[PDB]
């Protein structure tokens, strides 16, 4: 319905690799920050 997503040219079409949503990215960002800071703490005194 939105005109930006309608397509007529077979140059921008291919198989979908993966999907994503808000909560998964949010929890992943929190986990990666937490892992980074804990590795920082653990590798040293």
């Amino acid at each position: 319905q939105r005109p930006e997503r309608i397509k007529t040219t077979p140059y921008l079409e291919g198989d979908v690799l993966s999907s994503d949503s808000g909560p998964l990215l949010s929890v992943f960002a929190l986990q990666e920050i937490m892992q980074k800071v804990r590795q920082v703490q653990a590798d040293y005194m």
């Binding site: 005109p3 007529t8 140059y11």
Partner: protein
């Protein structure tokens, strides 16, 4: 050969080529109908086109503009298909010494009003039937018949246009079509036939062709960024396949191995053996050579591979002879020139001895020295595209303009190394004793370098190289000449394109091969012993292809102006909507054809738009029909979309039957049709916003009841409505009579008051017939309270009319042309595909 997908697409092209849209009938399509009343002198005449097209397609909203466009295309295809018929074998009678037409071929039906007529009306219609005549006319010195019949104007326009097209076909087009294909057969060594035009009944037969032979080449070239697609489909449809042959091995035995104790790099490479990759690479080299400019050779070195010095120096010295990449065209990028020249410089110094004194040039540029007793200057053989030195085309005529070519987009004859492509080649004997400048200077330098063996070898295989180039010029100047070749100005622009460093034109496709591959290229010769199967069908393919491209051209041209005519229903859309709409309503084959190009480079709306303004269109019947059909569809009122609707209260007439006989003799009917729209003072325009605020105040319905007490007219919105025609013998149902052209609801949720008001998008028109019995009171229909009617719609076109007896056949003002029942017609369009390919003599 070809990848199977494009072969399937071209098969579908040929399948679409072999269909016919026209029809041949005995009686034209029925255009008018008569409905008899209780009136014995007046009937209801209805042109059946309007009701026929009143029942097609589904409804509309401004919420679905792409659906609206899809519907519009369906309607224009409806009108295009309605009239595509040709009259033949028309029946007739004979009386009063004159041939007389049939009431059926008149196109109108009145056969259910005769038995209620009187003597005078029957006599008058008999005399009027006797009035109709036939005229023994002529067209292109052929007997035809002309008479008077009836047809609606939109169908009559297309019928007249097709008559003009068939007259033009029967006048001039077929002769020049035959001449042009015969010129093509002369130049391309192809034999065609004219047998089907030469039977003993040829003189009195009318021909039909759907496809014009001239395929204005500019229309195929005008396609933006399609050069790579044209190239790949050209080599798909036209490139033939042969076999690879080696010369007599005694030549290499005595030339490069005259001595046995010693050996040279060439003698080591003459014992080499092929693998599959080198055969593929030689195929790539020959493919590049058959298409100069567009296909350019490059080099690769596999990571798992290591080159040999003998391999590379032989590669340089031999590839200086194989290639023509200078002058006015080119074959290789500058990097190829640099590798070849440095390999040559290495080969010219591996055995540097006292008996040869070499004057080294001061410059750091490689290949800068003088060699030999004459001190021949080797600085000449730099590879510069400007002067062309170092290639075969150096100091040689390559491009000329000899005679008017069949394809005006391809005027060029290409002649490599001074050979001419008009003489058939006897490959076992041709090539013994001709020479040009580059080869002589090369052998003179080789002797000046003291290399006897290579000179003997190359002199021995000089005819072998010539028979190579002979077959090459045959395959280039004989088979490949078609509309798919690169244009003349573009071909001129190739060298500035390569040397400048920009890409305003199409970037030529680039190809890469191996070093040792060139030696195997020079020792395997290509022979076209079997020609491609789809050669004799190319002109057919162009005429069809050009036709659907012109179809899409006119579709874009007129579909562009949709929004300016109707701003209030296409409000939110974009050219992309009708772009995808016509992509929905076109065959798949041309879609794949552009798919092979536009997938590889982006395209946008402007590109299509500027492509519209190119005036290139291909003469063809479908183009004529569709152009005059869209020109017949300028008025949308003839498309059952209107806005002249009104919710207005009126009263049904319920007359007094004070005389049954006089009232029955007249035909009285009801219709809510409006002859003309009313004055603006009784009409107040309503939108969604005024209705929304009317509901917001809480005085919506009361205002409407007040206005209807005021006896006014209401135009609910400007959004075009869909209309339906109806006929009845009794009263219509309450739903269609008392109904409102809007919707209004109001509910409550969570302590909040919610409401919605819509406008009806579907409406209908109807006609009401009154039937009266003899044993009825004069005030039988008289009621204490007359009924109310709501719908009032307006039309310009006199869709339905009450007509007296003598005025029924006043519609006889259409001129119809027929051919004799003793004539005959055949199709000739597919007969274009026949033809045989004259295989050249070979040894």
């Amino acid at each position: 050969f070809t990848v199977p997908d494009v072969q399937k697409i071209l098969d579908d092209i040929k399948a679409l080529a072999a269909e016919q849209v026209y029809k041949i009938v005995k009686v034209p399509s029925i255009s008018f109908r008569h409905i008899v009343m209780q009136s014995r002198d007046r009937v209801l005449r209805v042109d059946t086109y309007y009701e026929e097209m009143s029942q097609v397609g589904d409804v509309i909203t401004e919420d679905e503009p792409e659906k609206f466009y899809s519907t519009i295309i369906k309607k224009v295809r409806f009108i295009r298909g309605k009239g595509s018929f040709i009259l033949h074998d028309i029946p007739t009678r004979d009386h009063r010494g004159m041939e007389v037409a049939e009431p059926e071929v008149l196109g109108v039906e009145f056969k259910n009003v005769l038995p209620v007529l009187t003597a005078e009306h029957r006599a008058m219609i008999q005399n009027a039937l006797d009035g109709s005549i036939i005229e023994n006319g002529n067209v292109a010195t052929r007997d035809v018949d002309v008479f008077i019949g009836a047809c609606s104007e939109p169908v009559y326009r297309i019928y007249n246009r097709l008559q003009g097209y068939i007259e033009a076909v029967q006048l001039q087009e077929l002769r020049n079509s035959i001449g042009w294909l015969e010129r093509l057969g002369h130049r391309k060594r192809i034999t065609y036939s004219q047998e089907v035009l030469t039977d003993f009944r040829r003189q009195d037969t009318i021909w039909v062709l759907a496809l014009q032979l001239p395929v204005n080449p500019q229309v195929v070239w005008d396609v933006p960024r399609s050069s790579i697609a044209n190239l790949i489909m050209n080599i798909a449809t036209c490139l033939p396949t042969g076999e690879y042959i080696a010369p007599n091995p005694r030549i290499s035995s005595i030339t490069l191995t005259q001595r046995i104790t010693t050996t040279g790099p060439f003698a080591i490479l003459t014992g080499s053996t092929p693998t599959a990759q080198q055969l593929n690479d030689v195929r790539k080299i020959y493919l590049a050579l058959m298409f100069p400019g567009q296909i350019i050779l490059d080099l690769k070195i596999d990571p798992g591979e290591r080159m040999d010095p003998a391999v590379r120096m032989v590669a340089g010295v031999v590839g200086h002879l194989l290639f023509t990449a200078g002058g006015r065209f080119t074959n290789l990028t500058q990097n190829m020139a640099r590798q070849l020249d440095i390999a040559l410089n290495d080969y010219l110094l591996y055995m540097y001895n006292t008996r040869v004194q070499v004057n080294y040039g001061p410059t750091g540029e490689p290949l800068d020295f003088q060699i030999g007793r004459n001190q021949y200057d080797c600085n000449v053989f730099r590879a510069d595209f400007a002067t062309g030195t170092g290639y075969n085309g150096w100091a040689t005529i390559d491009v000329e303009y000899r005679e008017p070519a069949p394809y005006v987009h391809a005027q060029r004859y290409i002649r490599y190394c001074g050979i001419d492509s008009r003489e058939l080649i006897n490959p076992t004997t041709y090539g013994i004793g001709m020479t040009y400048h580059c080869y002589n200077e090369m052998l003179r330098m080789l002797v000046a370098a003291g290399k006897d063996s290579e000179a003997a070898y190359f002199r021995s295989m000089l005819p072998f190289h010539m028979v190579r180039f002979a077959r090459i010029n045959q395959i280039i100047n004989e088979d490949l000449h078609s509309v798919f070749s690169l244009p003349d100005d573009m071909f001129n622009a190739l060298l500035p394109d390569l040397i400048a460093g920009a890409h305003q034109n199409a970037d030529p496709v680039v190809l890469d091969v191996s070093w040792i591959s060139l030696w195997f290229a020079f020792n395997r010769s290509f022979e076209p012993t079997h020609r491609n199967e789809m050669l004799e069908v190319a002109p057919l393919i162009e005429s069809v292809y050009a036709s659907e491209l012109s179809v899409m051209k006119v579709d874009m041209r007129h579909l562009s102006l949709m929004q300016r005519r109707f701003p209030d229903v296409l409000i939110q859309a974009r050219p992309s909507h009708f772009w995808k709409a016509v992509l929905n309503d076109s065959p798949e084959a041309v879609k794949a054809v552009m798919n092979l190009s536009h997938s590889h480079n982006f395209i946008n709306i402007r590109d299509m738009m500027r492509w519209v303004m190119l005036p290139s269109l291909q003469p063809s019947l479908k183009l004529a029909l569709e152009e005059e059909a869209w020109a017949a569809a300028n008025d949308f009122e003839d498309l059952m979309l209107t806005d002249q609707v009104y919710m207005h209260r009126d009263m049904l007439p319920e007359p007094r039957l004070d005389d049954i006989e006089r009232f029955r003799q007249e035909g009285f009917y009801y219709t809510n049709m409006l002859e003309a729209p009313p004055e603006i003072d009784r009409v107040v325009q309503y939108t969604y916003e005024i209705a929304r605020l009317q509901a917001n105040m809480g005085q919506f319905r009361a205002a409407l009841r007040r206005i209807m007490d005021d006896d006014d007219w209401v135009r609910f919105g400007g959004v075009l409505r869909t209309v339906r025609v109806k006929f009845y013998d009794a009263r219509p149902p309450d739903d269609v009579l008392q109904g409102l052209p809007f919707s209004y609801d109001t509910n409550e949720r969570g302590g909040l008051a919610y409401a919605t008001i819509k406008y009806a998008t579907e409406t209908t028109i109807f006609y009401l017939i009154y039937n009266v019995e003899f044993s009825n009171t004069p005030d039988s229909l008289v009621l204490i309270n007359p009924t109310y009617t709501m719908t009032k719609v307006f039309i310009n076109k006199r869709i339905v009319e009450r007509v007296r007896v003598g005025q029924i056949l006043a519609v006889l003002n259409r001129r119809f042309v027929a051919y004799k029942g003793k004539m005959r017609i055949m199709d000739i369009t597919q007969s274009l595909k026949m033809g045989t390919k004259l295989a050249a003599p070979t040894v």
